[PDB]
Amino acid sequence: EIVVESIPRPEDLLESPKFPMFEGSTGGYMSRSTRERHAITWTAKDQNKFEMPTGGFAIMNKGENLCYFRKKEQCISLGKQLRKMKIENYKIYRLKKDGTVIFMHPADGVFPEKVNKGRVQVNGRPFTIRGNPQQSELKWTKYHMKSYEADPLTTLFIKARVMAFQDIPNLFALPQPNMEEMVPVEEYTKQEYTTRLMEALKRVQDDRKAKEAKSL
Amino acid sequence: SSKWVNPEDPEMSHPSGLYVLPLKPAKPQENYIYTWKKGEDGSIEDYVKTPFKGPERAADYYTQRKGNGAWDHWGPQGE
Amino acid sequence: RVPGGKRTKELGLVVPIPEEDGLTDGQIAALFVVALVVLIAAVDLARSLYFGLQPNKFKTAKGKGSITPFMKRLIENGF
Amino acid sequence: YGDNRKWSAVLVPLTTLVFPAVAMGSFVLYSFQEDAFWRLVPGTKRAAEAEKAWREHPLFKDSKDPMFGLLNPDDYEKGLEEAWERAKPAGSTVTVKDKLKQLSKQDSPHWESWRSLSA
Amino acid sequence: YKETPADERLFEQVYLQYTSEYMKGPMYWHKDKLQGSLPDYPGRPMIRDGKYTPYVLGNLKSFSSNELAFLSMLFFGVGLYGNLQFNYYDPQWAKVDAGGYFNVSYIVESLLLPISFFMHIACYIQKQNGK
Amino acid sequence: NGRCATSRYLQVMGSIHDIESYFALDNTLSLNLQIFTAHWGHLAIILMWISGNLYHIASNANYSLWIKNPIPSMPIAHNIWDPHFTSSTSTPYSHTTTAAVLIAYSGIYNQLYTSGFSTVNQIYKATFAFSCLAVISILLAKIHIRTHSEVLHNSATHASQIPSFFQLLYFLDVGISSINIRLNFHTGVLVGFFSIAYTGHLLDVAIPASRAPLSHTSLSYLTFFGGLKSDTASLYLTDIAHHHLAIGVIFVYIGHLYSSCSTALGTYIRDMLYTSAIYMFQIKSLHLALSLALAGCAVLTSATAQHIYSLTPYFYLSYDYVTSVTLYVHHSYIASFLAIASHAHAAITLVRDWVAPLELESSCTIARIHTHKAAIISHLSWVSLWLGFHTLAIYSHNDTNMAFGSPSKQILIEPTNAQLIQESSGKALYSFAINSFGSFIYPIGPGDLYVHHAIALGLHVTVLILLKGALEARGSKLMPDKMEHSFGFSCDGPGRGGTCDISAWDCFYLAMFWMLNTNAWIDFYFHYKYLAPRQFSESSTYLESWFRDYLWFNSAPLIRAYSALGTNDLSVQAWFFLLTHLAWATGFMFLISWRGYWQELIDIILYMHLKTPILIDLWNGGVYTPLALSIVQARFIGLVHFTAGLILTYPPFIISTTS
Amino acid sequence: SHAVKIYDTCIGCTLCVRACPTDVLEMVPATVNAAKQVASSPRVEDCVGCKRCETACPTDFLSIRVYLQENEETQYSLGLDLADWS
Numbered sequence A: 001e002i003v004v005e006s007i008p009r010p011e012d013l014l015e016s017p018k019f020p021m022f023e024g025s026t027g028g029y030m031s032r033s034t035r036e037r038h039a040i041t042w043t044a045k046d047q048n049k050f051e052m053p054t055g056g057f058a059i060m061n062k063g064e065n066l067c068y069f070r071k072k073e074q075c076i077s078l079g080k081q082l083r084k085m086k087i088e089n090y091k092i093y094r095l096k097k098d099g100t101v102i103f104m105h106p107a108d109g110v111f112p113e114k115v116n117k118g119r120v121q122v123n124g125r126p127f128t129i130r131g132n133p134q135q136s137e138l139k140w141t142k143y144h145m146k147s148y149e150a151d152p153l154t155t156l157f158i159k160a161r162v163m164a165f166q167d168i169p170n171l172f173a174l175p176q177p178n179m180e181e182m183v184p185v186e187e188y189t190k191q192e193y194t195t196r197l198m199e200a201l202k203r204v205q206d207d208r209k210a211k212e213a214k215s216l
Numbered sequence B: 001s002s003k004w005v006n007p008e009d010p011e012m013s014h015p016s017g018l019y020v021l022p023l024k025p026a027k028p029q030e031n032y033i034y035t036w037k038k039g040e041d042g043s044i045e046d047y048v049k050t051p052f053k054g055p056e057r058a059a060d061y062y063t064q065r066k067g068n069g070a071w072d073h074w075g076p077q078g079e
Numbered sequence C: 001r002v003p004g005g006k007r008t009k010e011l012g013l014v015v016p017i018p019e020e021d022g023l024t025d026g027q028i029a030a031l032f033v034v035a036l037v038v039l040i041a042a043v044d045l046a047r048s049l050y051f052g053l054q055p056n057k058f059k060t061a062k063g064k065g066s067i068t069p070f071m072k073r074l075i076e077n078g079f
Numbered sequence D: 001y002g003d004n005r006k007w008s009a010v011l012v013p014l015t016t017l018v019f020p021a022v023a024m025g026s027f028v029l030y031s032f033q034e035d036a037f038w039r040l041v042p043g044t045k046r047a048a049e050a051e052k053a054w055r056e057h058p059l060f061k062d063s064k065d066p067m068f069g070l071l072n073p074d075d076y077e078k079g080l081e082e083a084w085e086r087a088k089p090a091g092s093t094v095t096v097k098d099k100l101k102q103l104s105k106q107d108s109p110h111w112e113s114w115r116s117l118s119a
Numbered sequence E: 001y002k003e004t005p006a007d008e009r010l011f012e013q014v015y016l017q018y019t020s021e022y023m024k025g026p027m028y029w030h031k032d033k034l035q036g037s038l039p040d041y042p043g044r045p046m047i048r049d050g051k052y053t054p055y056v057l058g059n060l061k062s063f064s065s066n067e068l069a070f071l072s073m074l075f076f077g078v079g080l081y082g083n084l085q086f087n088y089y090d091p092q093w094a095k096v097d098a099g100g101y102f103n104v105s106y107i108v109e110s111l112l113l114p115i116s117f118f119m120h121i122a123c124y125i126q127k128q129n130g131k
Numbered sequence F: 001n002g003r004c005a006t007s008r009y010l011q012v013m014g015s016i017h018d019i020e021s022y023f024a025l026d027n028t029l030s031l032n033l034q035i036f037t038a039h040w041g042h043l044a045i046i047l048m049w050i051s052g053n054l055y056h057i058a059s060n061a062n063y064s065l066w067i068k069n070p071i072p073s074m075p076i077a078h079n080i081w082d083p084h085f086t087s088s089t090s091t092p093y094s095h096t097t098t099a100a101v102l103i104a105y106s107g108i109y110n111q112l113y114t115s116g117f118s119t120v121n122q123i124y125k126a127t128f129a130f131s132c133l134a135v136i137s138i139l140l141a142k143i144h145i146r147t148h149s150e151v152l153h154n155s156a157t158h159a160s161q162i163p164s165f166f167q168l169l170y171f172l173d174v175g176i177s178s179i180n181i182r183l184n185f186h187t188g189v190l191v192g193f194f195s196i197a198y199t200g201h202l203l204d205v206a207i208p209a210s211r212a213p214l215s216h217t218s219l220s221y222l223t224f225f226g227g228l229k230s231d232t233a234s235l236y237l238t239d240i241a242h243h244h245l246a247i248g249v250i251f252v253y254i255g256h257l258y259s260s261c262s263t264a265l266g267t268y269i270r271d272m273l274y275t276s277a278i279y280m281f282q283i284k285s286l287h288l289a290l291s292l293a294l295a296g297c298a299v300l301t302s303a304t305a306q307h308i309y310s311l312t313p314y315f316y317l318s319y320d321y322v323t324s325v326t327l328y329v330h331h332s333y334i335a336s337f338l339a340i341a342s343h344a345h346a347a348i349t350l351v352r353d354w355v356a357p358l359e360l361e362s363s364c365t366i367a368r369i370h371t372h373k374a375a376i377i378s379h380l381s382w383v384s385l386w387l388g389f390h391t392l393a394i395y396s397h398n399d400t401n402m403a404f405g406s407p408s409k410q411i412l413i414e415p416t417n418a419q420l421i422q423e424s425s426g427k428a429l430y431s432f433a434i435n436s437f438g439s440f441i442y443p444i445g446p447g448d449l450y451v452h453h454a455i456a457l458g459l460h461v462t463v464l465i466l467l468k469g470a471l472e473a474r475g476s477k478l479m480p481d482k483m484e485h486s487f488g489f490s491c492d493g494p495g496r497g498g499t500c501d502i503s504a505w506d507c508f509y510l511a512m513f514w515m516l517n518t519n520a521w522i523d524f525y526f527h528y529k530y531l532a533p534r535q536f537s538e539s540s541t542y543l544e545s546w547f548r549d550y551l552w553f554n555s556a557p558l559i560r561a562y563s564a565l566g567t568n569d570l571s572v573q574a575w576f577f578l579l580t581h582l583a584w585a586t587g588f589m590f591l592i593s594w595r596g597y598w599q600e601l602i603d604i605i606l607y608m609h610l611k612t613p614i615l616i617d618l619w620n621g622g623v624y625t626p627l628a629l630s631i632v633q634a635r636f637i638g639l640v641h642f643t644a645g646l647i648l649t650y651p652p653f654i655i656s657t658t659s
Numbered sequence G: 001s002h003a004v005k006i007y008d009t010c011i012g013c014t015l016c017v018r019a020c021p022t023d024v025l026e027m028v029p030a031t032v033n034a035a036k037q038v039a040s041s042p043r044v045e046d047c048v049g050c051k052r053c054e055t056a057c058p059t060d061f062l063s064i065r066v067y068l069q070e071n072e073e074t075q076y077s078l079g080l081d082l083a084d085w086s
């Protein structure tokens, strides 16, 4: 439903009625070295004096006004100032080098501070801030050094692992592999091999029980 | 309600975090540089945007940049 | 020498200098040959460190890999 | 004594003026390579290829999975379903498989977005 | 039906408990569960029920508490005798300076005192274990 | 990644050797192999350093002439080939027609002389052999890389039939990460057998070289005299040989403790740690192992710094006024660096290695420490405050009373405890003698007491900062979620009252200043008591004596080195005195002025460059766009400037005063 | 780019969103709290790392966390003006 404005490239739009009356300064974008731009377009009922994020002051035309800047930060600061002046129709666009216009700030036409339907939480974590897993617990894994990006299931699993590994007296020590029984990959069923592994594990457990009960 | 579709992981939202697809221009702007243009009658302009056939600097670092995103990670919808 | 130390001037400490240099050109050349061998080996080691381990080797490299019997015994013993 | 200064006359310049200058020029040239510092600069083709090689190797093919280690995932899942059945609140429609899938999935599209540069 | 925060916490608790038991079990393999890591070496459980096992004594686990006590007492006596004789009541420094050799008995004997100490801690451990 | 700024170089250089942070370093196998290869390269560098020292002694120096008259002669380090020196007239370092030379203040001459070097040919043979050893080290690195690659290939090619084949993933780096076998062989062969071998070397080479009359090697070469032989003013060589024999035997015995090659013999370190007071810890943690090694190395470096000076082990080393001070200061600084290193790596271990249990569980030593970290820090702060208050107050009382001209009004607390310990040691030594030890016992006075309490203050405050960093690394009341963030991060924002220097790396940065201070205090104490024992004893009770009789008085030769009158052999020391002062002052800039001002200044400079006519058409600024140094980068750079200036401005002073 | 994460302790007061200098955050419907809304961070690519959201967060410890990632710095997170990486 939202319509993206034409917003011609600033190099093409040398003089326009939309541009507000502003003094000009050296704080404007460097045209020789940069090509990406940000355009802010709003509509004003009256000419209110306002301060350009790039140097001096300006006067906004009664009607449609359009300004060009280098950074979304400058555009957003100007938008905040306009909101203070009660101009809620302002929109921000990012202009690529080739003229593509991306509508940015009122992303869905509703200001971010106001709740809107169809919005789903992004980068949201379902636990308190200290609920994150320990960084040392997930090492040499996907989240090698980013414990604040682990999924809730991974956090829960790691927490359960740290609880489990406190009970030292009854922890199954992994049997040492028999390096002699190594064969080429080229040289059955997955379930059958799992069952055989389970028989081997039970044999190991029985042997361990006998060995420990020998002297105790 | 976001029209953007994440290319890497469809379940997740687009990295851009925008809700309106971009608008392509009628004719994309061509590469240009600001130079002088002698007026042929003794005059001369300072910042005249003139076409440039290729990249101004043909370094791999310069040419690898497409501007689709921070890492050019936006899907085809970015263009 | 023009000593600048109080103790040196007081006690007459001296920096005796030999009449002939300790080593000859041939000896310096031999030491430089050894240093050149060290440099070649060090460049090779730096390249190996830069590129790290190559787990793809099992796909194309000759042979089928080998583990020394002592290494196998260490593995069986564990940590 | 000091007749070995002919060695110094060739080595001290060659070592402290020529070699450092060559090294500096080579470092500047190397800085502009595709993989300048691939082990500390994210989003490098060489780093991505090395990671893919590790994944190709059989032992390490799934060593990056945080949940790796379960010998019998089916048995683990069956026990978890039994536990949830016993602990289920009355009139609960939450199933163990669905809950595990939901917890595994999350919405973090900005994690390591530089992977695109490499691929 | 709505899954409330209380229900999610209940699911988390049940998952934690059950899967922690599973990880303790032999069905889960982790680098921390190797020999030399957290778990005790197979067949040699050092601590059980919060009490030292005979395996903490290594090769002395087969020695009875009585003979361990006798050995500890004898070693303590012999080592203390050797140490006192070497240091105070029969000094050897003067003889060695003169050029004579030490009294080899005192040096070997004196090592028995720390051996006697550790043999008492082993005797206590064995006795406390019912052996 | 083409999109980069000039901070790329600093970001990379800050973690070039942080192998754990490397991209595509998938596993502990890669980590351990890389570390092993780096260790081999490091050994090669050390051997090349030894070979270079030996070569320069052999070629540019006067070892043969020095060994004839060691007392008045001064060793030569190396020649000076610097075009910038004056060519019209001879330099202060030449004999008016001779190559310029530098005196050597490393004691390597005494080391070689008492080791048994008699001719420059032997030094040349050693230079050659150590270069060969460097070659061997590099080749061993290559060999081990190849062997580990061959095991990965094997594991890829062969697989155990059962699904447990993935268990082999853990044992690929067993050779590098095994602890029992490494401990046994290190303590038995690398230490004990090395000591026995050096005893053999002494008996075969050093004893005959020192002794003018020939005598067959026998037990007569093993003795238990004590103290310093009068002639060489050094420990009897025969005693050093017995010393090393005894230590070697003891450590060879201790090297059978653990089970290394077979499980039939030896005990396990896991088992000892489990059954001992310290419950257990991540012995596999490379950072923890590094911390323990660094702590041990620091204590040993301090021990050698003290004992080389106390009991002279090298021929005529005591006679060298400058070399003694240089050695003591060098090894004191190395020891301080290693101590603070151990603390920093313990903090890193806590950050990214320790697997903390659940909060209420208290089973491991680290968890027990974290339970009462607050009490630990509060008590350490109390001790530091007490020491500082009372030391400074007594010093200021003495200062004011001396300024008013009444020494009798000074507070002079006699060091009764230290004097009693010293008297007991002297009683034991006198009994042994009845059955000389120079510098092992010193007069000890109230000035010594005050300086010792100052050094205790320095140590306590350094440990306070380091312990606070380590115990707040994982979390803190100000920043509870500090585990997620890296070891060193800039800040947490101006919110919550402001969060400058909130990271464990920032605690290290802070403790570095203290280390330097406490080391400066130690070095000043040693140097002052060494230069003027009597003046130090009488006047060291008030700080004006330190400021006037030590610094201002002894600064004359250095500053007078080069002037309008001329130059002498200390001119280089005078230029490095000022260069290091300038480096310190520069470090002040990065320490005081922070990043926003400099980023805006860089923006203005970049604007000027982009507005310049010729430069704009060539340089866009897109690639490696200039930026101001990050907060942590600037903290580190300012700390490096501060440390370099502080450390490097002292050696010129000590050389000038003791030469 | 930096990582801006939101935790369920969020109460939906919108102060983070209002303090955002480059509009990285937005309130979204939720049922976890009484306000029936929780801040989200869809446009984390524009986050500069000023931690003004963190300053404005009321909760005892922050329900919004900004993790700085100096290795993954982009032009948007660096606020580059004179130079362009696009």
Ligand code: CLA
Pocket: C028, C031, C032, C035, D007, D008, D009, D011, D012, D015, F045, F048, F049, F050, F051, F052, F053, F055, F060, F078, F079, F080, F081
């Ligand atoms: C690490 C030990 C070391 C050090 C610190 C020095 C230092 C010096 N040497 Mg050298 N030198 C060394 C070993 C060393 N040397 C060895 C083993 C030899 C025997 C081949 C020589 C032979 C030699 C001669 C013949 C001369 C010097 C001279 C010099 C001076 C200027 C440098 C030069 O011309 O090098 C030239 C020497 C080499 C290129 C040989 C290799 C030197 C070492 C092994 C390099 C080690 C590199 C290090 C580990 C890492 C560098 C990293 C880098 C990227 C920053 C300077 C005092 C000159 C002098 O006395 O001037 C008054 C001189 O004429 N040296």
Ligand code: CLA
Pocket: E056, E057, E058, E059, E060, E111, E115, E118, F249, F250, F253, F254, F255, F256, F257, F258, F264, F265, F266, F267, F268
């Ligand atoms: C520090 C104290 C200490 C303690 C508490 C233990 C405890 C143990 N050790 Mg021992 N051990 C120690 C030091 C210690 N060890 C040292 C220093 C070594 C190196 C020599 C060893 C080497 C060692 C091995 C190889 C083995 C043990 C084993 C054992 C177990 C049986 C002990 C036994 O039967 O002793 C009673 C036996 C004796 C008192 C006779 C010992 C005689 C030899 C020659 C050693 C004495 C050396 C002496 C102290 C130093 C001489 C110095 C020199 C100047 C003369 C037990 C857990 C065994 C075990 O079950 O391991 C799992 C095992 O296999 N230990």
Ligand code: CLA
Pocket: D012, D016, D019, D020, D021, D023, D024, F079, F080, F081, F082, F083, F084, F102, F571, F572, F575
């Ligand atoms: C303009 C001033 C100036 C300059 C340019 C030099 C230049 C030199 N002096 Mg010096 N000198 C000066 C003033 C100056 N001096 C003054 C005023 C005095 C007092 C009168 C002296 C007294 C003096 C003495 C007594 C000696 C020298 C020596 C030297 C030579 C050192 C060679 C060497 O080994 O470098 C190697 C340099 C280093 C190892 C230091 C490097 C430090 C930087 C920060 C780099 C650190 C490494 C890092 C990893 C970066 C690597 C980058 C690289 C790979 C590109 C060199 C020709 C020595 C000589 O003759 O040598 C043969 C020597 O013995 N000078």
Ligand code: CLA
Pocket: F050, F053, F106, F107, F108, F110, F111, F112, F115, F133, F297, F300, F301, F304, F308, F314, F327, F330, F334
């Ligand atoms: C930055 C680190 C650093 C530096 C620069 C120095 C510098 C110095 N140390 Mg050292 N030292 C350090 C750290 C350092 N130390 C630390 C951490 C410790 C504590 C462990 C010590 C402990 C120490 C002692 C105890 C002594 C020194 C001494 C010295 C001087 C060197 C003498 C020399 O090289 O003789 C040249 C070397 C030789 C003639 C022979 C070296 C023999 C070794 C064993 C060679 C290596 C063996 C080889 C690998 C074997 C091959 C394998 C085969 C056996 C199978 C010099 C002041 C000595 C000193 O003060 O002298 C006056 C001295 O006595 N240091």
Ligand code: CLA
Pocket: F017, F018, F019, F020, F035, F038, F039, F042, F043, F046, F286, F287, F289, F290, F291, F292, F293, F294, F295, F296, F297, F299, F300
């Ligand atoms: C790529 C860069 C790099 C480089 C150049 C080095 C260089 C070094 N590392 Mg390595 N290391 C690296 C990366 C690197 N490391 C990384 C990324 C890690 C992972 C955290 C490690 C982890 C690591 C560990 C765990 C250790 C080393 C050590 C070493 C040394 C190797 C051997 C050597 O020559 O020691 C020469 C050293 C000597 C001649 C001195 C020997 C004396 C030792 C150090 C002290 C022994 C004390 C003892 C335990 C207790 C005594 C008790 C007594 C007081 C009663 C050397 C300083 C070892 C070392 O010595 O650390 C201090 C060591 O233990 N490194």
Ligand code: CLA
Pocket: F582, F585, F586, F588, F589, F592, F593, F597, F601
């Ligand atoms: C001695 C200490 C010291 C030094 C050297 C500097 C240096 C500087 N400060 Mg200052 N500064 C200091 C302390 C110091 N500061 C402290 C403690 C603070 C905290 C309050 C500040 C705070 C501060 C601010 C806030 C600002 C400065 C500025 C400057 C710059 C002034 C302009 C300029 O560069 O001209 C002179 C430069 C020099 C004298 C540097 C040395 C040049 C030598 C003599 C020649 C080099 C020879 C050769 C090429 C060297 C090659 C070496 C290589 C081969 C190894 C300069 C980099 C201003 C600036 O950047 O303006 C542009 C600025 O805004 N400083």
Ligand SMILES: CCCCCCCCCCCCCCCCCC(=O)OC[C@H](CO[C@@H]1O[C@H](CO)[C@H](O)[C@H](O)[C@H]1O)OC(=O)CCCCCCCCCCCCCCCCC
Pocket: F009, F010, F011, F012, F013, F014, F015, F486, F487, F488, F489, F512, F630, F632, F633, F636, F637, F639, F640, F643, F644, F647, F648, G070
């Ligand atoms: C000469 C004798 C007297 C002086 C002795 C030396 C000076 C004293 C030592 C300095 C004190 C601190 C030492 C600790 C070192 C590790 C600290 C560290 O990595 O943190 C330094 C930190 C690491 O970086 C930080 O890491 C964090 C993760 O922990 C985060 O990622 C941060 O964002 C990141 O900034 O900061 C830096 O990046 C610093 C910038 C480094 C710039 C250096 C480039 C120029 C190098 C030229 C010199 C040659 C270098 C080789 C030397 C040759 C020697 C043979």
Ligand SMILES: CC1=C(C#C/C(C)=C/C=C/C(C)=C/C=C/C=C(C)/C=C/C=C(C)/C=C/[C@@]23O[C@]2(C)C[C@@H](O)CC3(C)C)C(C)(C)C[C@H](O)C1
Pocket: C025, C026, C027, C029, C030, C033
């Ligand atoms: C190729 C070929 C064939 C062949 C052949 C033949 C006959 C080849 C013969 C080759 C021949 C005859 C090669 C001599 C080399 C001598 C060298 C390298 C000496 C170096 C010596 C050095 C580097 C010494 C250096 C120093 O130590 C010195 C001396 C003094 C010291 O102060 C130090 C220095 C470093 C300065 C076949 C078998 C017929 C058929 C086959 O099909 C193909």
Ligand SMILES: CC1=C(/C=C/C(C)=C/C=C/C(C)=C/C=C/C=C(C)/C=C/C=C(C)/C=C/C2=C(C)CCCC2(C)C)C(C)(C)CCC1
Pocket: C028, C029, C030, C032, C033, C035, C036, C038, C039, C042, C043, C045, C046, C049, F041, F042, F044, F045, F048, F134
């Ligand atoms: C004499 C002669 C000759 C030759 C000559 C020459 C040519 C020489 C050269 C020389 C040289 C030119 C030398 C150099 C050297 C160097 C060195 C010796 C170095 C080394 C290094 C090291 C040891 C280390 C390294 C490292 C680093 C630093 C970093 C990281 C990595 C590594 C670890 C690797 C001839 C045969 C012709 C003839 C006969 C005679």
Ligand SMILES: CC1=C(C/C=C(\C)CCC[C@H](C)CCC[C@H](C)CCCC(C)C)C(=O)c2ccccc2C1=O
Pocket: D027, D028, D031, F009, F589, F590, F591, F593, F594, F595, F596, F598, F599, F602, F627, F628, F629, F630, F631, F634, F635
């Ligand atoms: C001076 C200063 C600067 C400005 C200094 C900068 C940006 C570094 C200046 C560059 C020096 C002169 C080195 C550059 C030398 C060559 C350009 C090297 C090029 C070689 C590359 C290939 C590595 C800061 O950015 C800053 C930030 C935070 C706290 C304090 C400070 C601070 O004090």
Ligand code: SF4
Pocket: F490, F491, F492, F493, F494, F495, F498, F499, F500, F501, F594, F631
């Ligand atoms: S930017 Fe600097 S002053 Fe501001 S909070 Fe961070 S460290 Fe402190």
